[PDB]
Design a protein around this ligand. Structure first.
Ligand code: ADP
Ligand code: ADP
Ligand code: MG
Ligand code: MG
Lengths: 193, 435, 96
């Protein structure tokens, strides 16, 4: 309503799903263990367009299964508990397609705080990001995904600003919509095809 | 008028103590505690006022000054806008009782009314602290920002009314000798960048410690030690010390800083023989001052006074967890010695100016879109905070929205719009050539 | 000077002549530290030797001893006291 009141040039029928991502890429995601409910597509559409690192909340690991499907090649999942997670992340930042961090429920480690910051330092041609004691060489088209298994998780508001939060929780009508898409495919297979 | 102001400041102070339900010591009200110090620095800031500028009728000019200064040590104490409203009513009742008869035309206290002794320095007045108009303040800050960008590292900021007011009342705490400033606000409130600017506005040299991933207590002490060598010399500009929650990697690094900021300098920072060599350098100054020399008691004391005057400690925390409250409980010096300053979220009117600044140097059909978008940018951020309040009551799940979150959102939206517009323009140009 | 400070100021002079220590209690606002800090300046630096100690909640028993050790000069034998029969005052703030 507030876009019409001002009278800013905009299309008659806007929906966030269409802008964030095309129809074809929604059909790709559907194949990579994602449900056809709009809430999950919206969520999947956000992480694509995210200018910040996306912190994901996944009870029943619905988000994690999708992330693993999308990143088919050179995806590495490193929990906070692992002792060489600092060493693995540093070697990953240099030449890693994507990175996934398990656990990290709340109280995010101080070593990740410079990485979490989207601002990077450019030294001539190369780009350098300072993590731990020794700075590590940063490469473009690096992706970082943070998954956390919790119900009503509590974060620092400084972190909620720094990093965009997104929830993959299958609740209320949100689960119903997934079962409909599933039912429709079994009932009227011909129409979906 | 002096006696009336003393009964007034008491009256306001007394009406707050009577309302124990409104204001009391609590978990989230660790600072709310109302001391002598806030009355003392209010009484201090009147003493700052030179005779020559306040000469004449002080029926109208003094009460304004007092009211402002009073307000700026009580407002910052308060977190909630409800508590603020309650205070302003007590402050008006207090003034109206002791003064008796006052004009109803112009409210004695007003949000527009600010007092600063940096505006004077720009106009070529010497040690003058008076009321400055909002439009005059704008021109001085904007000019000084260009000077800051020229010599130091370039800092971009919106410079809205509320941010500028925050610059004014930090400049004020730095102008007071011995008194330390504490800035409290949510992540991205601009306070660290507002401090660095505020410091530069006044004739002071800001020194921030740099924390590496692997840091030690002895490494911190050596950084502090270096700062005290520059203060010890007689002909020295007063060094400001900048600290943030990120800079405090462990709680051990805070212990030295509080003993510095409380009084003088941390016990056994340097050896006794090194201290003696600093004392001898200050002895040359003491002769010029006309203070007792070769007494080795008043001189050593005078050295501690100078060090206190020339060291300013600026602390920056976020009141988001009970960790900061545990700092207050653990560290007594911090809350009582320093002057607390609380940053509220940016007003709807300020948010419009932020958007209006970032939309500049982007092409639009009639530039009426710009002026409207800037409104919608403020409306969207406000409507999230109202929805976030609804979300907190409805479900246990807590969402948080900061002014950095808002800034980063706008930059991302602008980049996406520019990319889509460029792609559309290239496609249209290709179509036109083909046609 | 206040009516309350002058009468406490007298009580301190009484309590300084004797080896009985003094303890001050009250809110943050009350202004106790300053009332003691005024007196320590007014006392003669030969008769009495004053030193302030402030606990930030990480001050271990060992760290307090290091501050006391430095304050106290080394008398003859195992006993440690100030030379020329000077009385040694150690001011403690934020005791609890
Ligand atoms: N008013 C403002 N206008 C533009 N950018 C701002 C403004 N306030 C803050 N910023 C940006 O956001 C950052 C916030 O970080 P900082 O100033 O350290 O504040 P905080 O300590 O609250 O995080 C700034 O360094 C700057 O890049
Ligand atoms: N006569 C006085 N003049 C100015 N300040 C005073 C006076 N008496 C007490 N104070 C105040 O006392 C405080 C320091 O002593 P005190 O209140 O006991 O400290 P604390 O609150 O840390 O225990 C300061 O706020 C100081 O201004
Ligand atoms: Mg910051
Ligand atoms: Mg005290």
């Amino acid at each position: 309503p507030d876009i019409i009141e001002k009278g800013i040039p905009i299309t008659e029928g806007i929906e966030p799903l269409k802008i964030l991502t095309t129809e074809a890429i929604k059909s790709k995601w559907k194949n990579e263990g994602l449900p056809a409910d709009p809430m999950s597509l919206e969520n999947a559409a956000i992480i694509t367009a995210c200018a910040r690192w996306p912190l994901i909340i996944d009870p029943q690991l619905q988000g994690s299964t999708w992330i693993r499907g999308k990143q088919g090649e050179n995806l590495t999942t490193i929990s906070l508990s692992q002792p060489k997670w600092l060493g693995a992340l540093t070697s990953s930042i240099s030449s890693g397609r994507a990175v996934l961090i398990e656990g990290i429920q709340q109280e995010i480690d101080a070593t990740l705080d410079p990485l979490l910051q989207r601002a990077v330092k450019k030294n001539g041609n190369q780009l350098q990001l300072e993590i731990g004691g020794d700075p590590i060489d940063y490469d473009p088209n690096f992706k970082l995904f943070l998954m956390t298994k919790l119900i009503n998780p509590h974060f620092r508001p400084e972190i909620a600003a720094q990093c965009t939060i997104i929830n993959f929780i299958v609740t209320e009508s949100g689960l119903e919509e997934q079962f409909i898409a599933m039912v429709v495919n079994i009932e009227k297979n011909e129409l979906e095809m | 008028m002096a006696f009336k102001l003393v009964e007034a400041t008491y009256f306001t102070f007394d009406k707050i103590l009577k309302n124990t339900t409104a204001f009391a010591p609590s978990a989230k009200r660790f600072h709310y505690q109302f001391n002598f110090r806030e009355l003392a620095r209010v009484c201090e800031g009147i003493c700052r006022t030179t005779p020559g500028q306040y000469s004449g009728g002080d029926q109208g000019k003094l009460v304004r000054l007092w009211a402002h200064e009073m307000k700026r040590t009580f407002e910052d104490r308060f977190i909630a806008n409800e508590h603020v409203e309650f205070f302003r009513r007590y402050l008006t009742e207090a003034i109206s009782k002791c003064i008796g008869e006052f004009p109803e035309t112009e409210n004695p206290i007003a949000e527009p009314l600010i007092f600063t002794g940096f505006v004077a320095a720009h106009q070529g007045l010497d040690q003058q602290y008076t009321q400055c108009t909002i439009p005059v303040l704008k021109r001085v800050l904007d000019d000084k920002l260009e000077e800051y960008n020229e010599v130091k590292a370039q800092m971009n900021l919106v410079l809205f009314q509320q941010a500028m007011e925050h610059v004014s009342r930090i400049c004020r705490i730095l102008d007071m000798p011995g008194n330390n400033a504490l800035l409290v606000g949510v992540g991205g409130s601009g306070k660290q960048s507002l401090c660095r600017l505020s410091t530069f506005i006044n004739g002071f040299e800001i020194d921030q410690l740099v924390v590496t991933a692997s840091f030690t207590i002895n490494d911190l002490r050596n950084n502090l030690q270096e700062i005290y060598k520059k203060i010890a010399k007689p002909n020295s500009i007063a060094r400001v010390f900048m600290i943030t929650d990120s800079q405090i990697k462990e709680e051990q690094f805070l212990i030295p800083i509080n003993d510095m900021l409380n009084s003088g300098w941390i016990f056994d920072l340097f050896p006794k023989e090194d201290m003696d060599s600093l004392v001898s350098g200050v002895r040359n100054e003491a002769k010029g001052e006309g203070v007792d020399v070769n007494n080795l008691t008043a001189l050593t004391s005078y050295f501690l006074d100078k060090i206190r005057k020339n060291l300013k400690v600026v602390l920056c925390f976020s009141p988001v967890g009970d960790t900061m409250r545990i700092r207050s409980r653990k560290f007594p010096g911090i809350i009582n010695n320093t002057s607390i300053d609380w940053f509220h979220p940016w007003p709807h009117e300020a948010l419009i100016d932020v958007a209006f600044r970032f939309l500049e140097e982007i092409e639009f059909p009639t530039e009426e879109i710009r002026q409207s978008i800037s409104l919608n940018m403020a409306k969207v951020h406000s409507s999230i905070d109202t929805a976030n309040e609804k979300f907190l009551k409805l479900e246990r799940r807590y969402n948080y929205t900061t002014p950095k979150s808002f800034l980063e959102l706008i930059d991302f939206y602008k980049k996406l719009l520019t990319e889509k517009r460029e792609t559309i323009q290239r496609q249209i140009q290709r179509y036109e050539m083909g046609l | 000077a206040t009516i309350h400070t002058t009468r406490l100021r007298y009580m301190i002079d009484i309590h300084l002549q004797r080896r009985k220590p003094i303890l001050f209690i009250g809110s943050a606002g009350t202004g106790k530290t300053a009332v003691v800090r005024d007196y320590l300046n007014s006392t003669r630096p030969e008769q009495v030797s004053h030193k302030t100690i402030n606990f930030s909640s990480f001050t271990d028993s060992l760290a307090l001893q290091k501050n006391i050790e430095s304050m106290v000069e080394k008398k003859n034998g195992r006993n440690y006291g100030s030379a020329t029969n000077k009385v040694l005052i150690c001011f403690i703030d934020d005791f609890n």
